[PDB]
């Protein structure tokens with residue numbers, strides 16, 4: 007019903023897949039949405055596509071300086087952020103024996119410390135504008151499953167959940183909620199181009215319902231968590247995977 | 254925007270507290286709602302209060318015969334149920350040493366086997382009408398916490414989550430989701446009559462946010478789970494307690 | 501090193517499979533072990549097999565009167581119980597549509613309320629003898645997985661975990677711990693004689709390690725929980741399934 | 748009865764507190780133990796104290812080069828490692844608003860990526876020697892609780908559990924188990940010197956049992972996980988906190 011009218015949400019890694027699917031929904035919810043991504047072109051293509059409520063600002067979540075610039079510009083245009091959706095991440099396919107310290111470090115830096123960098127700045131910004139924000143970080147259900155071929159990723163995602171829980175309590179007093187969502191396999195654009203695409207049949211088997219997971223499936227849940235209906239929920243993780251795992 | 258228009262939802266223990274708060278919200282969602290309760294007067298007082306969307310049918314969830322009659326009548330009026338909200342339960346305050354086999358049996362019979370009796374009939378009804386239903390059972394976050402003075406209740410609630418998970422996979426093939434919600438302390442008409450009321454200050458301390466939990470807090474989340482936004486969620490438990498526990 | 505010398509442990513459903521495997525181990529730990537079972541012959545065959553550390557006493561965990569008689573006799577012989585292992589349960593294979601109220605009730609009564617009946621009496625007995633006991637209840641990892649063809653069972657097992665958590669806090673002040681173990685598929689006698697036996701190849705696939713689960717695998721863990729090494733652990737659930745699920 | 752005789756175990760951060768308590772116990776189990784720590788003097792003081800089964804080798808878990816040197820020397824002396832206990836970590840007390848990118852990075856680097864660096868090398872070493880190893884990583888129950896004043900730490904520890912789960916499946920085929928333990932508040936030498944010490948009375952309240960947590964409490968559990976009794980357990984987290992949280 008355009009419940010999010012008047013609100014400003016930021017989505018990272020929003021140039022495609024789930025991030026984009028989310029930005030699109032929040033916009034449909036009436037919010038003005040900052041489509042952020044490391045891919046400046048994709049970001050602004052996506053915002054053009056979303057259209058009007060959507061504004062593109064490129065940023066590398068793992069770089070402190072571009073994240074500062076990200077938020078500065080948001081403050082200017084909107085006076086601050088009401089909703090933060092930590093979506094940007096690297097989704098690797100790496101056999102255990104290919105897991106380098108180098109690989110490890112990159113995945114951790116983006117998927118994990120990158121989300122702190124942004125959350126640090128974003129919550130500071132809500133706090134400064136006296137807004138009762140919502141933080142929502144996209145994790146993964148690989149954390150519950152111990153999925154193979156992506157150890158650094160599962161660690162980092164474990165990290166994001168840890169972070170989420172501590173943050174919830176850390177920010178409760180500022181009326182800011184912090185939650186996480188664990189998507190199962192989703193037919194984003196990242197997966198379609200990923201060895202991971204080959205796993206749909208096997209994960210479908212393990213699911214209680216039997217479609218292929220779709221970005222809108224996660225977007226529609228983020229939309230709820232960003233809404234007032236989810237006001238009494240903080241520190242929780244929503245698992246969205248057609249019953250792959252039970253949480 | 255009345256997304257639940259055309260749908261029929263049944264809420265048990267709906268004469269007051271959370272059940273009523275839920276029936277009220279689902280009606281606001283546009284659904285026609287069967288307000289069911291063991292307290293026939295309260296049920297029908299509550300449906301009068303709700304509106305023309307609400308209809309009262311009294312039933313003891315722990316009695317097979319009254320649950321049969323509950324559903325028969327629903328089939329007649331509506332051709333079947335789309336949404337099931339297992340809310341009816343007994344919320345005891347019993348010191349461990351007062352936990353009788355007798356007390357144990359009563360709590361288990363209603364809070365647990367009573368929810369099976371209804372779910373059995375309700376999902377059969379959806380199934381028979383070829384409706385892609387939603388089951389939502391109200392558990393409790395005492396299951397995560399191991400809360401004292403209510404051991405039978407915590408077992409039964411553990412049971413409802415167990416049930417929920419198995420059911421999810423059991424019904425996935427008929428396009429029926431089954432989920433659960435674990436409310437923390439809520440200032441219901443029930444609680445207000447309980448010694449439990451005295452615990453608000455302590456639980457508020459442990460919460461990340463600092464209000465007293467309110468029935469509308471849980472109703473608003475049930476409303477989401479009943480909606481299409483939650484279509485990719487089955488077998489999961491939503492914990493709603495202002496950050497009391499982290500799930 | 502016979503750490504359990506001087507201690508008295510009771511194992512229910514101990515005539516075969518895991519219960520027997522456990523009684524055997526606890527006896528090897530030096531404990532005198534009451535082998536209890538509904539099958540009087542099996543129980544006492546098993547105790548004969550185990551040695552002179554083992555004594556057989558038949559009992560139906562779901563019957564309050566035979567449970568009373570069970571413990572009275574134990575008090576006489578040993579002056580009370582130090583360790584309680586709730587093992588006795590019914591392991592069904594029932595398609596959802598065969599799940600009767602009748603089936604439901606039977607499974608709940610034994611697997612769940614039966615374990616309360618015994619735990620009530622057992623912990624009272626420890627308490628009365630001023631013993632700092634250990635309660636250990638065998639659940640199942642189907643509770644984490646939402647395994648199909650056994651809905652009543654998954655609910656009851658959910659219940660036992662609920663019970664366990666509440667009990668931990670309930671008895672902490674009497675220096676009594678209460679824990680639970682969730683075995684995955686185990687090649688016990690009942691499994692071998694049950695449509696469940698056919699699932700070994702599939703569950704082996706999902707396991708991180710690739711043997712068939714063996715009763716000694718669970719017995720060896722119970723032995724630990726019954727020991728002083730596990731003294732700071734209460735309210736927890738040990739999941740033992742070669743990595744089927746991650747808990 | 749010295750079950751760990753013949754085995755070689757490495758413990759990091761083993762100069763004091765839990766690490767030392769663990770090294771001591773594993774040695775008592777008969778294992779030859781590498782007492783590793785960033786504090787070379789503490790490490791070798793601790794091994795002198797422990798005994799002749801204990802050997803000290805200093806190393807910074809967060810530095811790849813010293814970790815290489817750590818394991819090379821172990822290979823020389825023992826032909827490789829059978830058991831790995833990731834204990835070394837930084838236990839901070841930082842108010843949210845003091846959480847720097849700089850602070851964040853340090854905690855993540857040691858507590859999380861430092862445990863990868865060691866696990867990478869250690870498991871490679873077991874693998875190379877054809878040994879069916881055990882990995883045990885000490886996390887924290889703050890991950891379940893969302894404890895405040897230590898957000899970077901709670902994230903990292905979340906990460907260690909993530910890592911653990913993925914690793915379990917990653918190494919199951921080489922007969923190597925990987926588990927984690929979540930200690931609650933423990934009265935170690937670090938904690939005694941931390942503003943965390945002041946929290947004992949509060950955490951004691953929330954505990955089901957009411958002592959102050961002791962390093963031996965965790966050591967005795969690690970000992971079990973290192974033993975054959977825990978051979979069917981991989982990808983699991985043992986929570987040891989006197990019932991603070993229920994896992």
Ligand SMILES: NC(=O)c1ccc[n+]([C@@H]2O[C@H](COP(=O)([O-])OP(=O)(O)OC[C@H]3O[C@@H](n4cnc5c(N)ncnc54)[C@H](O)[C@@H]3O)[C@@H](O)[C@H]2O)c1
Pocket residue numbers: 018019020021022023024025042043044045048065066067068092093094095096097116120144145146147188189190191192193194195196197
């Ligand atoms: N899609 C899945 O099946 C899968 C499963 C579970 C969870 N997830 C999570 O969902 C989210 C979206 O996944 P997806 O599959 O849609 O991803 P995707 O690969 O389709 O797109 C991710 C986007 O993130 C951006 N990005 C990468 N690094 C960045 C950084 N340094 N700074 C800013 N932006 C960066 C990329 O440019 C890309 O456009 C991710 O957090 C992922 O962890 C994905």
Ligand SMILES: NC(=O)c1ccc[n+]([C@@H]2O[C@H](COP(=O)([O-])OP(=O)(O)OC[C@H]3O[C@@H](n4cnc5c(N)ncnc54)[C@H](O)[C@@H]3O)[C@@H](O)[C@H]2O)c1
Pocket residue numbers: 265266267268269270271272289290291292295312313314315339340341342343344363367391392393394435436437438439440441442443444
């Ligand atoms: N209030 C809380 O803090 C709390 C927390 C977690 C979960 N819950 C759950 O929420 C649900 C309702 O909560 P509440 O606090 O509003 O309870 P309440 O006491 O305020 O109302 C419960 C209603 O259930 C009805 N009922 C009792 N037995 C019945 C039967 N056999 N058949 C049909 N109806 C029956 C009662 O008549 C009553 O109208 C319960 O399942 C309870 O377990 C409550």
Ligand SMILES: NC(=O)c1ccc[n+]([C@@H]2O[C@H](COP(=O)([O-])OP(=O)(O)OC[C@H]3O[C@@H](n4cnc5c(N)ncnc54)[C@H](O)[C@@H]3O)[C@@H](O)[C@H]2O)c1
Pocket residue numbers: 512513514515516517518519536537538539542559560561562586587588589590591610614638639640641682683684685686687688689690691
């Ligand atoms: N084997 C598995 O795949 C598996 C998996 C998860 C959990 N479990 C649990 O392990 C435990 C043992 O399983 P199992 O396969 O060894 O069982 P089993 O069928 O092989 O033997 C269990 C014993 O319990 C007894 N029993 C049944 N009802 C009783 C009653 N009311 N009172 C007293 N005794 C009764 C039976 O007579 C039998 O001797 C059970 O609690 C089960 O729930 C087993």
Ligand SMILES: NC(=O)c1ccc[n+]([C@@H]2O[C@H](COP(=O)([O-])OP(=O)(O)OC[C@H]3O[C@@H](n4cnc5c(N)ncnc54)[C@H](O)[C@@H]3O)[C@@H](O)[C@H]2O)c1
Pocket residue numbers: 759760761762763764765766783784785786789806807808809833834835836837838857861885886887888929930931932933934935936937938
């Ligand atoms: N004690 C608790 O309340 C508590 C609770 C949960 C988990 N833990 C975990 O247990 C472990 C030890 O706890 P503690 O109370 O003994 O802390 P402690 O401060 O007494 O000792 C930790 C040890 O880690 C070592 N260390 C630090 N950086 C290192 C480096 N990079 N390389 C090698 N060693 C390094 C230190 O020298 C120290 O000896 C830590 O992992 C901590 O996270 C502690």
